[PDB]
Each structure stands twice: as structure tokens, then as C-alpha cells.
Design a protein around this ligand. Structure first.
Ligand code: UMP
Length: 249
């Protein structure tokens, strides 16, 4: 893996390190999360992956806060944002150092074929997946749905489900998960105060084919359970970050 070019400028976040293919930021100031509302952190971070790769953006904290896991498309030249939700019904604070923000690359593949939709732009990582039925997501509840018809099989890659940013901004998070052979149960949580009605055929998540190297059972400084959970640890590509300040917009 050749360089991930990046720029970073944000005096409210510290660059902890950019090592072994993962860049980590930490919060220098308190971030307040109101209950029932989305909190977005504008990272002041811009990045471009090398050929054949996307980027994965995620947050880690021991506080009662859930972060959207973001799939960053290779053509994306805008600012990266971290989308957070409050698990509690009262204000939750992330004191300095309590939030870690990680960025790292992965190889992905794309099939040519709803319910699974082609990438919307050249090189987009995820294929949107359509809802098979109408769902009513009441506030602070989780609703699950099963996808049973197999996605296309891609040698040496593994189908996985991630959320999309638009729904996350509305307070609806998808728990990322592997789509194994017998089907996948996709769980959607509504962290807002509004009942959200999602109808049949609505795009509600995306299918990503991660190269099999990026999924491991082994814990190390090269992997993290914060992406897809503790069974399927995310092991990112061994790329090098290269600072290119002109990427900042
Ligand atoms: O947590 C996220 C997810 C996505 N993006 C950027 C990069 C993506 O290419 C683009 C669109 O994301 P989606 O709507 O596909 O999730 O937004 C972020 O900044 N943060």
C-alpha cells in the first residue's frame, strides 16, 4: 500500500499519531452531546487513499456515546466529519482525551449486477441496500431486519454491511456486521426523539466487500474491534500517511 495523503488542521483535536497505517486524533476540549440529538464533529481532516483502497473512519470511547462508522469514498475531497449519538436520555460529555478518532485504509471490490444497487459514483465503495419492508423506528429503540438472499460472491473478499451518513445524521445508526452465508440480521437504532418511518425499498445501509485480509480474530496494534465488533476485528492496510497541507479546504 502506497501513501495515504492527508491534511489536518483543528486546534480542538490533537494528532496522537499516524502509525502503521492508522491516524488517530483525540479531543482536546469537552464535547457535549445533548440527548435525543446528533452531535457532529467537524474534523478539519482531509484524506485521499491510494489506488484500490477506501478509508474507514470511526470513533472509540468508553463513554455512553455511539459513533457512526464512516466509509470514505476514494473520490471524496471534502472535509471528514464524525457523527455521534448519545446513548443516554440526559446530556453526556466527552471530557478531553475521552474520544479517539481513527482513520485507516482498506482494499475493497465492486460487483456489477435492487435490493443491491450499483455505486452512485465511479469508485464509490458501498452498494446501497434497499429495505425489504416498511419499518417504524420508535425513539431510543432498536429494530432489526434480515437480508437472506446472498449478495454476489467475490473471491478473496467478504461482504459486510455499514450505515450511511444521511440516516446517521437523522439519529439512525446501523451496527456494522458481516454478511455471512446464511444471511445477516441488520440492526438499526434510533437515538432521536422522533419516530422514524422507513418504507420498503428505502436505502437503509450499504454493502461493502472488504478484502479478506482486513478481517482477523487477533488483537494487536494493527487491528481494532471498534469497527465491526469483537468477533471480526478490522485489520487495516499497512499504508503510510503523508502530510500534504494543500488538501485542506
Ligand atoms: O462518517 C462519515 C461518513 C462519510 N463521510 C464522507 C465521506 C463519504 O464519501 C461521504 C458520503 O458518505 P455516505 O453518505 O455514503 O455515508 O461523506 C464522512 O465525512 N464521515
Amino acid at each position: 500500500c502506497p501513501h495515504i495523503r492527508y491534511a489536518f488542521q483543528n486546534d480542538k483535536l490533537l494528532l496522537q499519531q499516524a502509525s502503521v497505517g492508522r491516524l488517530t486524533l483525540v479531543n482536546k476540549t469537552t464535547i457535549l452531546l445533548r440527548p435525543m440529538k446528533t452531535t457532529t464533529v467537524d474534523l478539519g481532516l482531509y484524506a485521499r487513499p491510494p489506488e484500490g483502497h477506501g478509508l474507514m473512519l470511526w470513533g472509540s470511547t468508553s463513554r455512553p456515546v455511539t459513533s457512526h462508522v464512516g466509509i470514505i469514498d476514494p473520490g471524496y475531497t471534502g472535509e471528514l466529519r464524525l457523527i455521534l449519538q448519545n446513548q443516554r436520555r440526559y446530556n453526556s460529555t466527552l471530557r478531553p482525551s475521552e474520544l479517539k478518532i481513527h482513520l485507516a485504509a482498506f482494499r475493497y471490490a465492486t460487483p456489477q449486477m435492487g435490493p443491491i444497487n450499483h455505486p452512485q459514483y465511479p469508485g464509490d465503495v458501498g452498494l446501497d441496500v434497499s429495505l425489504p419492508k416498511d419499518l417504524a423506528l420508535f425513539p431510543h429503540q432498536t429494530v432489526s431486519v434480515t437480508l437472506t438472499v446472498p449478495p454476489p460472491s467475490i473471491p478473496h473478499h467478504r461482504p459486510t454491511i455499514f450505515g450511511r451518513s444521511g440516516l446517521a445524521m437523522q439519529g439512525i445508526l446501523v451496527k456494522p456486521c458481516r454478511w455471512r452465508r446464511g444471511g445477516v440480521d441488520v440492526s438499526l437504532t434510533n437515538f432521536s426523539d422522533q419516530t422514524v418511518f422507513l418504507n420498503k425499498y428505502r436505502r437503509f445501509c450499504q454493502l461493502v466487500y472488504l478484502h479478506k485480509h482486513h478481517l482477523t480474530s487477533f488483537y494487536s496494534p494493527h487491528s481494532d474491534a471498534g469497527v465491526l465488533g469483537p468477533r471480526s476485528l478490522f485489520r487495516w492496510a499497512s499504508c503510510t500517511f503523508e502530510e500534504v497541507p494543500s488538501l485542506a479546504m
